[PDB]
Design an enzyme around this catalytic site. Structure first.
Site: not given
Ligand code: MG
Ligand code: MG
Lengths: 468, 457
Positions: A153, A179-182, A273, A307, A315
């Site tokens: 982030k 992980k990289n962002d998608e 992803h 995922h 949540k």
């Molecule tokens: Mg992401």
């Protein structure tokens, strides 16, 4: 509408020559469920019924068959002779038959695939996974416990060096996986070549300082196949075997991209992803296919991981049912959807070794003893959402397995001592769960976890982690 | 939520650095629209907020009454290399998986001129296909084969032969027609070529076949494409790709590896994104704009109600025109600045139904054409042309040719005769006094209850 696609009670659909599917189905006003089902069956198979001719033997048929109906609940069961699907284990082709134009028929107002069944004979024809969470644990030199990972982030906007440094911090604190962002790719402010290079250098530092291996999952989704392959080959030249996974945006890049990486790089973890799946899978959309169905096809196509959510943990509200169903479809020898039981093996159900493996699975034992060449190997859930050290124990107890990869954002980076301490706090919380010690007691000795108790009980996160 | 993503009234979103989007957006019960908009903007761009530049998507307008949200995306945030799957991953990705967002439907997008520079657009167009077919102006009349799956390679090819022999131009594989054991791919290609050769020999006319090359994997798709290229004469084949299920990357790969082959975007599966009944997804006009950006030569539409025509007409405009209007954004399909006098004159000429020749090839997005799926037939083709307002389309008729009481060859002839009647401003009944195929069609297709009607794509 041709009545020949309606064969209610047809005994042969269970003979192994058919893939089965349950649709929630509703025609427009004036159309009966059975008429609607006939049209769906036709458009998802042979199109039109032909009595004389076609390539079938006299004794054979390629038509999909509606074999059970529940008008009360707007459900229909359709059997697809899987011979009708493209050879070469082509999964996009299956989805084109059953989840293609039928979603575009304005005369079909509800059209949701709720479950599918793969008979053992059909499983022979598809890859299934090859590189699994067990292989990743071996590279990480860990046993039993979940793989604890992170998203970075802000997810987009960091330079290559800034991005790699937060990877360094997380891994340095004991985190396993980033992980990289998608859609993190070759943005000019974080160019792909430098991103990979700086990740390698960051990982080298962690390995030298901690003695421990680590994994980074790179988004290789691209404009075209040649570019994706060039990225994959570059990564292989830049990173040690085992230290990288390949993230593919399976929904937007496509099923073909998933299968391509599965086959060209079989000994690399294939990270599906699922960004974009919601249009198919969300409860609010009467047209599509559900998350359990997506998960089953991802395993068939050979993803090593896909995922899920957090099984309601953290949540507010949230049912665990769907995420646990998906996790079991991904991981187990025996799994269940809403309508079909699934054995993930080409071994016929009556086999004594298979049934024993199924019973041993219920007792908590892996089923690799059957032979990887006779089973569909396991795919693991990758957990996206608001977990943190205070919740990892409850999550393990809820999902009922440790065979998952977490990808925590706020639950590590918001730690008041920083990302490194945040990763440490997750490991410490896991140890407390394993040793059956309360968080509070385990944290008397451990400032990272103690700080996490104080912070994650009360903090109002400005930018909470979101679903995948 | 973070307020930094809410910038209502920010005038800079129109400065050319932003892709614009309109969402129909509604939070789950208990979430305000502003909070929902901030989270959707964040998750479709920088994720969270942390010297003169910025990559954050900006919410710049909100219509509470109509649940509309306008979001500006700095297109620098998108992957380089003209990657269209990446755009869809940002704006049409996890936002669809946010249970806190109960309605999330992309209604329109806008591509500024300097963004368009970065993407391929189409290369091979309907105009190129017309040149191969040796025709001008008129639509390209095509067919699907029925039954769509199950025929032998020779049976499939013979129905191609019949359709082409009657004057039909174009046949497509079924969208999931591939290497099934009962109609193996190599024999299918071979027998299509043999069939086409016979038609060429007997009529002197060229013909086109669109082959599904959607495959398990990239190497298999490329093997098929290369095989077709070795087996079919240049121009006589198109490449059909299941864009939704095979993926956006498959579309762009064929666009770039085979730029001089018509790229046929078969949109099977799009309904989960685009249907009105689905509150989460993106609409047909949005799909069509991205298909053109990715460089498809054609993409399917319906029959414009031949139901409202609005959606299919909008798709045709976004596909074909220099200037097209969505529900929220006007789109010039050019990298030329909007104030340019030549550009404005060209747009004016196009609006007047006139040809414009004052631009120059390399600074405009080339045209993509609709491929018409549904129940057209000789009685309806004229009405369809009038309704869609263009002849730049390919039809893929099934029952409207194959159910003709005189057979498939006569059915293709009847469509061409109907087109001749339309072009010559002669009534169908008057033109058919002399033309038995059309005459049979006029008296048949107004009453036949088709056992297996054509279905949408
Ligand atoms: Mg992401
Ligand atoms: Mg079809």
């Amino acid at each position: 509408m041709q009545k020949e696609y309606i064969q209610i009670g047809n005994p042969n659909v269970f003979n192994g020559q058919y893939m089965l599917a349950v649709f929630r189905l509703q025609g427009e006003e004036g159309m009966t469920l059975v008429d609607t089902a006939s049209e769906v069956a036709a458009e998802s198979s042979t199109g039109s019924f032909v009595k004389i001719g076609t390539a079938t033997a006299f004794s054979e048929s390629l038509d999909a068959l509606v074999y059970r109906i529940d008008e009360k609940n707007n459900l229909v069961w359709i059997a697809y002779p899987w011979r009708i699907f493209d050879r070469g284990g082509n999964v996009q082709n299956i989805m084109t038959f059953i989840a293609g134009n039928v979603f575009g028929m304005a005369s079909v107002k509800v059209c949701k695939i709720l479950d599918v069944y793969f008979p053992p004979q059909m499983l022979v024809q598809y890859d299934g996974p090859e590189y699994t969470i067990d292989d990743m644990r071996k590279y990480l030199n860990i046993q039993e416990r979940p793989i604890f990972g992170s998203i970075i982030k802000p997810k987009i906007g960091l330079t290559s060096s800034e991005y790699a440094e937060l990877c360094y911090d997380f891994w340095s604190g004991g985190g396993d996986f980033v992980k990289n962002d998608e859609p993190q790719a070759d943005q000019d402010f974080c160019p792909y070549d430098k991103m990979v290079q700086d990740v390698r250098h960051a990982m080298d530092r962690v390995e030298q300082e901690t003695g421990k291996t680590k994994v980074h999952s790179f988004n290789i989704s691209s404009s075209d196949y040649d570019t994706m392959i060039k990225k994959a080959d570059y990564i292989q030249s830049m990173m040690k075997p085992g230290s990288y996974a390949f993230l593919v945006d399976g929904i937007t890049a496509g099923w073909m991209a998933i299968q391509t990486i599965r086959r060209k790089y079989p000994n690399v973890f294939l990270h599906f992803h699922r960004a974009g799946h919601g249009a198919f899978t969300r409860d609010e959309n009467p047209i599509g296919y559900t998350v359990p169905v997506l998960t089953k096809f991802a395993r068939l196509a050979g993803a090593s991981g896909i995922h899920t959510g957090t099984a309601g943990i953290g949540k507010m509200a949230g049912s665990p049912k769907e995420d646990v169903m998906a996790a079991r479809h991904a991981l187990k020898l025996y799994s269940e959807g809403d309508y079909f039981k699934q054995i993930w093996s080409e071994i016929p159900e009556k086999d004594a070794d298979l049934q024993l493996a199924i019973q041993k699975e219920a007792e908590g034992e892996d089923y690799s003893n059957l032979g990887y060449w006779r089973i569909t190997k396991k795919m693991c859930p990758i957990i996206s959402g608001g977990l943190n050290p205070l919740l990892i124990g409850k999550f393990i107890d809820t999902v009922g397995t440790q065979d998952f990869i977490t990808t925590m954002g706020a639950g590590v980076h918001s730690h008041p001592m920083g990302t490194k301490a945040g990763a440490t706090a997750v490991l410490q919380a896991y140890e407390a769960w394993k040793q059956k010690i309360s968080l509070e007691d385990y944290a008397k000795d451990k400032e990272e976890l103690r700080a996490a108790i104080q912070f994650y009980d009360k903090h109002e996160e400005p930018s909470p982690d979101r679903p995948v």
